């Protein structure tokens, strides 16, 4: 039996708003009162995009049965067939260097962006507010892959790598359409932690 660690760091590229806690705040780590990326968000953007890149039948949408590669890669067991999640996406947190740089350069951690509403035929200005996480910041995340078959690791890892590229090109969190959600990945590191597997 074997477990594969993935260590890596996300850098935020466009303003970012997840806003779980919702003047519409963002999620925060209560022991640090600092932004986080609830890895649930990673999981969801991931699986949704992957289903999109693979077959996504209208009937399959209605019945929530996902593509077999997708389903096996993340585990579903909603159609009755026992399936254990083959990859776990955990949360992520600010990097020590990122926080140190912010304090040294007096960089605010959050930005309030005004969103003005203009109506046709009236053009009545009612600003709205929204919060964004400081762009360019980096979080440290972990992906833990579990080995359940010594022959499926290669195929599963290939799908994960292509999906990482898709996540970079797309937007994560809410308001992806307006310019919120573009992140990059850097410093990917691969190292099996448990077992005698060659990586």
């Amino acid at each position: 039996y074997s477990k594969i660690k993935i260590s890596g760091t996300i850098e935020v590229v466009t303003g970012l708003h997840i806003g779980g806690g919702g003047d519409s705040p963002v999620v925060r780590d209560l022991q640090t009162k600092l932004p986080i990326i609830p890895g649930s968000s990673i999981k969801g953007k991931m699986r949704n995009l992957l289903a999109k890149h693979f077959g996504l039948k209208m009937k399959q949408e209605s019945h929530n049965q996902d593509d077999e590669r997708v389903l096996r890669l993340f585990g579903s067991s909603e159609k009755g067939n026992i399936q254990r999640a083959r990859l776990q996406i955990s949360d992520a947190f600010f990097s020590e260097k990122t926080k140190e740089h912010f304090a040294q350069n007096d960089i605010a951690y959050t930005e309030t962006k005004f969103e003005n509403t203009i109506n046709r035929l009236t053009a009545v200005a009612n600003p709205r507010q929204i919060e964004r996480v400081t762009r360019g910041s980096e979080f440290d995340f972990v992906f833990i892959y579990n080995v359940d078959e010594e022959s499926q690791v290669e195929d599963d890892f290939e799908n994960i790598e292509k999906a990482i590229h898709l996540l970079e090109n797309d937007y994560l969190g809410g308001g992806g359409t307006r310019g919120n959600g573009r992140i990059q990945f850097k410093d990917t590191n691969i190292e099996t932690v448990v077992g005698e597997y060659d990586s």
Binding site: T14, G15, I107, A108, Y109, T110, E111, K113, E115, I118, T134, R135, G136, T177, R178, G179
Partner: peptide, 18 residues
């Protein structure tokens, strides 16, 4: 104009989309 946490001026995608 708007500036960011790095006080860099940018064109908001919301304005372009609108």
């Amino acid at each position: 104009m708007v500036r960011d946490g790095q006080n860099k001026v940018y064109l908001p995608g919301s304005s372009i989309k609108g």
